[PDB]
From a paper:
Among the over 800 known human G protein-coupled receptors (GPCRs), three specific receptors — [name], GPR65 (T-cell death-associated gene 8 or TDAG8), and GPR68 (ovarian cancer G protein-coupled receptor 1 or OGR1) — were identified as proton (H+ ion) sensors regulating signaling within acidic microenvironments. [name], in particular, is responsive to protons and engages with various G proteins, playing critical roles in angiogenesis, endothelial cell inflammation, and cancer cell metastasis suppression. Conversely, GPR65 is activated at relatively lower pH levels, primarily signals via the Gs pathway, and is implicated in chronic inflammatory diseases such as inflammatory bowel disease and certain tumors.
The pH-dependent Gs-cAMP assay was performed within a pH range of 8.5 to 6.5, and the results revealed that the proton concentration-response curve for [name] reaches a maximum intracellular cAMP accumulation plateau at pH range of 7.5 to 6.8. The [name]–Gs complex was then assembled through co-expression in insect cells, followed by purification at pH values of 7.5, 6.8 and 6.0, respectively. Using cryo-EM single particle analysis, the structures of [name].5GPR4–Gs, pH6.8GPR4–Gs and pH6.0GPR4–Gs complexes were determined at global resolutions of 2.9 Å, 3.1 Å and 3.1 Å, respectively. Structurally, the seven-transmembrane (7TM) bundles in [name]–Gs complexes at pH values ranging from 6.0 to 7.5 exhibit similar folds. Of note, two disulfide bonds (C903.25–C168ECL2 and C9N-term–C2587.25) are observed to stabilize the receptor’s extracellular domain, with the disulfide bond C9N-term–C2587.25 unique for [name]. Specifically, in the [name]–Gs complex structures, E392 and Y391 in the α5 helix of Gαs form polar contacts with Q451.60 and E512.38 from TMs 1–2 and ICL1 region of [name].
Numbering used by the authors:
A (entry chain R): 7 to 300
B (entry chain A): 11 to 47, 53 to 61, 205 to 251, 264 to 394
C (entry chain B): 3 to 340
D (entry chain N): 1 to 126
E (entry chain C): 6 to 61
The structure:
Amino acid sequence: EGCHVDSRVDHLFPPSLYIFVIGVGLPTNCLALWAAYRQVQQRNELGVYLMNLSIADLLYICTLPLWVDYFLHHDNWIHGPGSCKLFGFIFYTNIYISIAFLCCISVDRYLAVAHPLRFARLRRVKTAVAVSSVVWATELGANSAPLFHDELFRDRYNHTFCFEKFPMEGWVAWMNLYRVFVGFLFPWALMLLSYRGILRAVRGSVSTERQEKAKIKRLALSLIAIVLVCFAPYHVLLLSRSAIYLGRPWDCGFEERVFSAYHSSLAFTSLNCVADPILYCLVNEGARSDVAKA
Amino acid sequence: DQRNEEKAQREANKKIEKQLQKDKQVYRATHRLLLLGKNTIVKQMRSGIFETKFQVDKVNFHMFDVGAQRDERRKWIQCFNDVTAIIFVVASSNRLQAALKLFDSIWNNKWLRDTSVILFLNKQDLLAEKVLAGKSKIEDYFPEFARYTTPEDATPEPGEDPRVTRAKYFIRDEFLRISTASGDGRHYCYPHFTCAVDTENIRRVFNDCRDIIQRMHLRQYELL
Amino acid sequence: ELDQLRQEAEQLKNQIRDARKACADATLSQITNNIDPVGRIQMRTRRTLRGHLAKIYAMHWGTDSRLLVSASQDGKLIIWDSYTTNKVHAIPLRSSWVMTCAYAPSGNYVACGGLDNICSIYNLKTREGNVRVSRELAGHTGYLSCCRFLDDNQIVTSSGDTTCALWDIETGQQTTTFTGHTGDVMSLSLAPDTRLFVSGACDASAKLWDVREGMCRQTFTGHESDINAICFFPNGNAFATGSDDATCRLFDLRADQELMTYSHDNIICGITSVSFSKSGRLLLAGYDDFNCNVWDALKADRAGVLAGHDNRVSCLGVTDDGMAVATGSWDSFLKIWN
Amino acid sequence: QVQLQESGGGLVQPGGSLRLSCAASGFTFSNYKMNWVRQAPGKGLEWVSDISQSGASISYTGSVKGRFTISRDNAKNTLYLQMNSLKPEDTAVYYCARCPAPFTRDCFDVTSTTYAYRGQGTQVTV
Amino acid sequence: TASIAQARKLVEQLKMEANIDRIKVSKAAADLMAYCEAHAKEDPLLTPVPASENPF
């Protein structure tokens, strides 16, 4: 019935790093939200996107402690079906909404910098809220597929998972493939493309000194690379797990081998929630200045 | 009765606010420039203040040339602080010194420190004659030109003696000494040489405005 | 010959200085130190009249102290209902660069002007339904700096051609032209009796003019830079001027002398706007430091700071009943303080 | 009451020295970037040299560079402008005009024909 | 003869403004102080205004 998964580091480090993320990101996420409010006061379209990214991060942080508890009990959910179906749906889908908002920020910056005298109607708070609501609704609707299924799967090895039956199901495999591809790689690719275009425009500027170009390049490379560092192990492991499940559903040794790596990858993916604020608001001089004023 | 006039005020506000949103769109679409010195520049571009409109690449430009106003610019120049750029046409052939200190005052003005300046260097065609045989301000009123050589990063501009080019870049460097000192990303003082062959100064101002707007977009989008 | 006239001017200057020195019986501080200070005056933004696109260069109150006209460089003259933050009218202007705007004391009319060197009067309460321009006034050879209605069919305008003018709006002609300044006249304020008006200019001088006969009765000096703002005291026997030397100073007509210096060491930016209160106890002055200082007119002390504007404060006004303070500024926002 | 009273120089032989100071009683004489402007007869007002608020930051034009030097004196409220080795480009009414505003490095309009804080009196007839 | 005409205008303006009857500065400040005192109770800017009767 159930795969014989076993771990020796999942019960220890993922809870610790979740606790660290909860401790540090929430103040930084609140600061980012306040900075986004201040920007949207000044008719800044980027303020809406930063707002939405921050609030998605707060949702993830607030849903984290239950999953810390779940990982501490060696993969046991002791808080009921509905609580699982809600908090484990907020816990997932939130990295994907955050990725989509990062893509929106990148596209907005590219339109503003590469084409500074055109697309006036897209760079508006009304268009910002329209696009933000559209992406919120579409992400919720597209990732609410698990909500129609019962998620309390129990093996014979004293495990009780909220999500992710480790014997693995067909629908969860397809949904994981859709996440790993559409919700991660496509918007990250758009973020990369937007920041490449931004770097091209910055190198093409005349009023920009060489030092400012180097700073801009370093910041953009940080923006591109942080998401990959945080997210690539998790989605690589998901792709591999779903792939071998498609090849051999009865296969169980690889699940046991990669259980620890999979939980470690989830823990690492949780780091982008704190990476986004300290690198989209705190790093910049003006946003840090207004935060200090606050 | 109070409720009726309340709805009247509300509907009047609604109409005024929708009109103001349309006017916000129009105002944001338009870019403002100020010409300071020439009528020739106005003519090739397309009462107390003269208004000139032109379009380059479907972008709306508004240009303001001050007319019937006194020579004292010390306060009405404060109005043109939200403009995209200040087009400063220098005669460059004493005109040179007075224009130098006008540029100094514009560059070091408190309300024009964030306002970029476009510098065009008019009367380049006769500069060749005035340096070849004039024996004038460049030779006399600026004796440091003799000990000044042509910088390596000089455009070719063929068909002229090296003295012409070195004098041109000499007074350009005199302007750039003020431009560089107390200079940051707020404003840049783009230097250009006037070309009377065609009206391509419109494209030069358009590119400069693109650079300025890109700079402020780097600023407000937290990309710096 | 010219040397004789220069010597005559010098000796008249010496005689005037001697007469003024004789007139200095006592300083304002010596007889003022015995009154209680107004205290730390702090008033919050009761209402923010957002809706302007560009910087607000001028604004004026209505007589009823409820409606408010405002001028901004985007070219719009918005009439506000400050009681209900409602825009009553939005008048487009032919010339975007407007530096002054006035509300008629009887309503029904609003004037504006700027770098166009033209004062344009608009009819609000018309039987047609929409606000349209009524009379276009021309004749000034410099930029319009301040325009104030004294009553219907007559307006007083200040210009950058060192001259102030009186107009008859029905005929559109200059009834009386005031000359004598050598610098850009910047602000004009009318007396409550509607018979005199002062004008501060860039020559560091303030002149009191007689409206009907049209002569400069008395002239005032004492500043070391351009006088940017002027405002008659609630009683028409004194007025206060702010200049670019980072100081505000008070004048008196019947003394031809200097009254109080509102300056502080930290204050290094000039004054853009000056407006008294109903009682005249508060000299609310706008500064380039993005804030307004509530200077006690009697006791020269910073008794209040009206912080809240991101950019320079360009205009300032107080209601007729003294129940509100309007503060336009270059951040394209009008804030009401109480 | 801004005053810029001048001390007339007088006759100077070609190649001589005058070194005549000025006066100031209206402004503080420490926060204004005062300069020197002269009106040769038949020409418009022409800039000569500048002095910073307290010291240094001297600017010249070539017609005066290497020949005459400035000396701001805060104690005496005087702008000396020591001048020597006169050439034919002289014999003008010298005005020691000051900045329109204090605490700034801006001189927008000093060479105009209607500037207020200019003064008159220094004749340097050669 | 424009300069001499301007000088004549300046001197005549000076002599017309030199005969103006002037009072002592203390007397010219006492009336201002009295005016400030008399209207003190009617100034909502200085004297706090009741919240009920405040339009704002």
